[PDB]
């Protein structure tokens, strides 16, 4: 590289602060809000639901080419928040890792194993002086053979955990508080309504069918599937009435 | 005053969206003597202006040889010119040896540009500091090209580069109308007349600082020096 390392307690990834704080990791964490959107994932009794915002401000764009819901495998779905190029690159890496695991072991990779592998890869970037962390977080949903629905999350620092209902984006704290309030006190229809109501209450939007996109997995149908405009509108009308 | 931090490297973008090392390298072509090139419907010629450090020295070579149908003229650094000439010779020899067919000038120039673009993006390197004029003949007719330190090439028809080349370029632009329907003698006369504009209006185009390279359909690349340029010079008029 021959570019050296900048001098300062921040401004480099391999320098510890006088009380052992890495500041480039926190700045990468701040980089998630640059997109301006929010994501919500809720796990039901026998289903999982992903809901995220959609924002097209230009009438010259093609709305079919703007999306944030990806499909890593026939049984695993993902939603990305942060920089678009970084999100797409990380999706490609996840697909490659899943294919390699399938080839090496002989059966489809589990969601927790995929998240752990991605986090293990991401941890290396925070120790070397050549690479930089990606500014995005990934949420994975899937159906386990013996455990049921599963929701996971990863962050630029290399830390991953499994949840019951989590959120990411710009309104993460308010969404988390709402989710705790709901959980403390669920069929397929209740999970979608809960997620949509959480997003709408947090953002104060009163959504239209063309501003959200939903993807679900169920025990009866364990294949990741993206809901369509008619189904989203039907759910919104049922929620309103 | 704000340029200090943004012009020491070739992998750094200025806040205005500029790379200053490329422009600084481009400034180095104007450190050499002027050279002139032009073409016609059958022939392509190269004219250069040799310069000696003092009286007790031999003028350095400004026109090199690449292949039986390709020749170049240089202006700028010398090590870069030698490296580029070696690369061109190797490419032409390899193509001839393998395909038994001469390497086209367009492919040669594209290869040169692709090779030259690389050291302007990565660390630990610097841009090449030489500008080239390439003359060749192939199945598509005579050709003449120009090469920039910024890895850019132009398919010109009459161009001059070097120090104080503006007058020669103006003369060529004025007289480019009557170049296609000419033969070798008056083509070389036009080239010499264009090159004479560079010198101050007290000197003369003597037979000690002029190099001529000629390529054509049935004529291979040939370089004339010293007494060999006498037949091409008696017909010139006064200033």
């Amino acid at each position: 590289m021959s570019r050296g390392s900048s001098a300062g307690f921040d401004r480099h990834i391999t320098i510890f602060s006088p009380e052992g704080r890495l500041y480039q990791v926190e700045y990468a964490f701040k980089a998630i809000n640059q997109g301006g959107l929010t994501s919500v994932a809720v796990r039901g009794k026998d289903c999982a639901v992903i809901v995220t915002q959609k924002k097209v401000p230009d009438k010259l764009l093609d709305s079919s080419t703007v999306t944030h819901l990806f499909k890593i495998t026939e049984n695993i779905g993902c939603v990305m928040t942060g920089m678009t190029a970084d999100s797409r690159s990380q999706v490609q890496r996840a697909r490659y890792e899943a294919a390699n695991w399938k080839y090496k072991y002989g059966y489809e990779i589990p969601v927790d194993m995929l998240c752990k592998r991605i986090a293990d890869i991401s941890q290396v970037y925070t120790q070397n002086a050549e690479m930089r962390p990606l500014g995005c977080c990934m949420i994975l949903i899937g159906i386990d053979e013996e455990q049921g629905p599963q929701v996971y999350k990863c962050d630029p620092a290399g830390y991953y955990c499994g949840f019951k209902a989590t959120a990411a984006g710009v309104k993460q704290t308010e969404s988390t508080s709402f989710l705790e309030k709901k959980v403390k006190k669920w069929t397929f229809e209740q999970t979608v309504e809960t997620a949509i109501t959480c997003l709408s209450t947090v953002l104060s939007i009163d959504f239209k069918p063309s501003e959200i996109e939903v993807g679900v997995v169920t025990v009866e149908n364990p294949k990741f599937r993206i809901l369509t405009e008619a189904e989203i509108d039907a759910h919104l009308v049922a929620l309103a009435e | 005053m704000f340029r200090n931090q943004y012009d020491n490297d070739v992998t750094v973008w200025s806040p205005q969206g500029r790379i200053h090392q490329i422009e600084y390298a481009m400034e180095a072509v104007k450190q050499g003597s002027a050279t002139v090139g032009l073409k016609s419907k059958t022939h392509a010629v190269l004219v250069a202006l040799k310069r000696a450090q003092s009286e007790l020295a031999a003028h350095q070579k400004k026109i090199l040889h690449v292949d039986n149908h390709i020749g170049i003229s240089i202006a700028g650094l010398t090590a870069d010119a030698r490296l580029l000439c070696n690369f061109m010779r190797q490419e032409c020899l390899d193509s001839r040896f393998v395909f038994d067919r001469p390497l086209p000038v367009s492919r040669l120039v594209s290869l040169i540009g692709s090779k030259t673009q690389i050291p302007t993006q990565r660390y630990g390197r610097r841009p090449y500091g030489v500008g080239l004029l390439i003359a060749g003949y192939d199945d598509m007719g005579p050709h003449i090209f120009q090469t920039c330190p910024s890895a850019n090439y132009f398919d010109c028809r009459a161009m001059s580069i070097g120090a104080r080349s503006q007058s020669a370029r103006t003369y060529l632009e004025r007289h480019m109308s009557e170049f296609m329907e000419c033969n070798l003698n008056e083509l070389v006369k036009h080239g010499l007349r264009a090159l004479r504009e560079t010198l101050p209006a007290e000197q003369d185009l003597t037979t000690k600082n002029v190099s001529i390279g000629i390529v054509g359909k049935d004529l291979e690349f040939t370089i004339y020096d010293d007494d060999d340029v006498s037949p091409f010079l008696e017909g010139l008029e006064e200033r």
Binding site: M1, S2, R3, S6, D10, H12, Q24, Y27, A28, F29, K30, A31, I32, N33, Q34, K59, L60, L61, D62, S64, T65, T84, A85, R88, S89, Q92, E130, M131, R132, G135 | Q5, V10, T11, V12, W13, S14, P15, Q16, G17, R18, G113, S114, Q117, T120, Q121, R122, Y123, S150, A151, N152, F154, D155, C156, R157, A158, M159, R169, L172, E173, M176
Partner: protein, 240 residues
């Protein structure tokens, strides 16, 4: 963002990379190129500034060909654009070799966008300084247009415009009926837009360069015939 903008692997306190922003600012140092997608084809158009009369007619071309079905228009640094065109040609040729049929435009755009983005992560290289468009047409797919950004993000467009004056160009593009016109009217509209957006005091003179790919060319990228270009120029000058 002074102090955090000397490398491509450094984050600002608000979480943004500034070398990429400088790279995207570098593209507004060149002329303006626009592209409009119509009912049955895609039409390109660029504004080329003449440097001197010595250059041959057909030098410094800014409209390339990838294969027999894909066009390309660039803006920004020329050398980077040439390298990216070579990469796109290599990708398309390799896909054709492996799979035996023409490559869809979306996959080509994805591959080139990821290759461009790969230069954003390391301190040993420099981000690209050029943005370009792609276009094609197939009987079972119709017209398709795409954008590539020095940051590495791609999108599908109905009308696009890049360069020095993209804002005004988009402003006049938005007041058009793209979905209910053919190429014959779109070429004239593009010429009119280019003539409107051009500034005369700063730039001495310019020459147009138009091209389309569509149904009437059987899905092949080609240069507009001279007579159509001349009549479009006359129409634009008269309307101006």
């Amino acid at each position: 963002g002074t102090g955090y903008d000397l490398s491509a692997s450094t984050f600002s306190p608000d979480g943004r990379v500034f070398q990429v922003e400088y790279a995207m600012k570098a593209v507004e140092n060149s002329s303006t190129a626009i592209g409009i997608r119509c009912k049955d084809g895609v039409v390109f158009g660029v504004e080329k500034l003449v440097l001197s009369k010595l250059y041959e007619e057909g030098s410094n071309k800014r409209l390339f060909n990838v294969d027999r079905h894909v066009g390309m228009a660039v803006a920004g640094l020329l050398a980077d654009a040439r390298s990216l065109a070579d990469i796109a040609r290599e990708e398309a040729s390799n896909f054709r070799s492996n799979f035996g049929y023409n490559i869809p435009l979306k996959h080509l755009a994805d591959r080139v966008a990821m290759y461009v983005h790969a230069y954003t992560l390391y301190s040993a290289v420099r981000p690209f300084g050029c943005s370009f468009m792609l276009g094609s047409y197939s009987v079972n797919d119709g017209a398709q247009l795409y954008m590539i950004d020095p940051s590495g993000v791609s999108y599908g467009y109905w009308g696009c415009a890049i360069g020095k004056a993209r804002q005004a160009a988009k402003t006049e593009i938005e007041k058009l009926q793209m979905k209910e016109m053919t190429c014959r009217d779109i070429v004239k509209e593009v010429a009119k837009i280019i003539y409107i957006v051009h500034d005369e005091v700063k730039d001495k003179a310019f020459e147009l360069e138009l091209s389309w790919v569509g149904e009437l060319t059987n899905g092949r990228h080609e240069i507009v015939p001279k007579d159509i270009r001349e009549e479009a120029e006359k129409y634009a000058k008269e309307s101006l």
